[PDB]
Design a protein around this ligand. Sequence first.
Ligand SMILES: NC(=O)c1ccc[n+]([C@@H]2O[C@H](COP(=O)([O-])OP(=O)(O)OC[C@H]3O[C@@H](n4cnc5c(N)ncnc54)[C@H](OP(=O)(O)O)[C@@H]3O)[C@@H](O)[C@H]2O)c1
Ligand SMILES: O=C(O)Cc1nn(Cc2nc3cc(C(F)(F)F)ccc3s2)c(=O)c2nccnc12
Length: 315
Amino acid sequence: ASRLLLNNGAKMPILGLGTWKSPPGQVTEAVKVAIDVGYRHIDCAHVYQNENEVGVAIQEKLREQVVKREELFIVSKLWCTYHEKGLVKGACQKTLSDLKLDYLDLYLIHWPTGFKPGKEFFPLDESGNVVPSDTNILDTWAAMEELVDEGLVKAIGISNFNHLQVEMILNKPGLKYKPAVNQIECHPYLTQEKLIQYCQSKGIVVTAYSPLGSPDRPWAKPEDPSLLEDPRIKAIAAKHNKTTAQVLIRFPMQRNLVVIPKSVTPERIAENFKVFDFELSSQDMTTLLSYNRNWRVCALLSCTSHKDYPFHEEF
Ligand SMILES: NC(=O)c1ccc[n+]([C@@H]2O[C@H](COP(=O)([O-])OP(=O)(O)OC[C@H]3O[C@@H](n4cnc5c(N)ncnc54)[C@H](OP(=O)(O)O)[C@@H]3O)[C@@H](O)[C@H]2O)c1
Ligand SMILES: O=C(O)Cc1nn(Cc2nc3cc(C(F)(F)F)ccc3s2)c(=O)c2nccnc12
């Protein structure tokens, strides 16, 4: 229906609101609107630099009695500069303090790559290479497991992990908690068929990020493809009397993925939720899958020699 079962027994809403690039001055209103029109899943991160303002909106709607806390599914992520085992708890507590919550529904390792700890989110050397930390995936995972044991988070997962990285965790000797979710970039130009098959086969729920192709991403080039403007996808939308955005959001839902489109624009927040009253056909699905180009929008050149860089592998 509208939620997917996780390995902890919780039900994760299949549609959530993304908040990357939602400025602090606009995100509070965005979240308020989203909760009013039915969103019950918000995707957050420390690196988005807006958790306080998301937290404001959630607090206001709890106090207004619009929703109760157990009806909300709040996700955040551990940033790359906090992979050291001793920094993980503090990072989670900082996120909880900013969001004004006492627990998260889901906390992800944001990227498999640890960066040098410090004030800078992207510590670069003078030649522009990211500076790694001497952290590894398995030790970071162990610190994430402690958060569940301490009741700060209900479920833990990963983001931007390739299948070998997922495998590494699943095969961890003394594994305490299996990853619940892998959050990955997924859209018609990067359909992720092998990694989705892998993760679903392993009972890991997949969340599709950048489902509209992140047209506001800060490194977009003029000559880059644009999903929302793809005349072929416009044609599918017109046939169903829907928008291109609604098709792009429905697409992952029919693959049994969670999807988290971002908007700060109230009309679009509402538009993006109106995706439960139509179905894409088998032909439409096949057609959208056929647009795959292995075109990835979320990666940084500056990280490509990190030992744990995820996107050298086929999947
Ligand atoms: N785990 C990770 O590493 C990671 C990476 C990337 C993204 N994410 C998550 O996934 C979320 C979504 O990805 P994203 O932010 O990259 O991009 P996206 O959701 O693919 O696209 C957002 C862009 O599309 C616009 N838009 C939204 N609804 C629209 C509609 N109905 N019609 C036309 N334009 C529309 C937004 O404009 P306005 O906001 O101005 O309306 C914004 O410019 C993020 O916000 C974040 O929560 C996670
Ligand atoms: O991380 C997100 O959820 C979205 C996001 N993506 N990016 C592109 C990035 N790409 C990467 C790539 C790596 C990698 F794992 F080394 F591959 C590690 C960290 C990053 S962050 C930003 O530069 C970035 N900068 C600020 C805030 N968010 C971002």
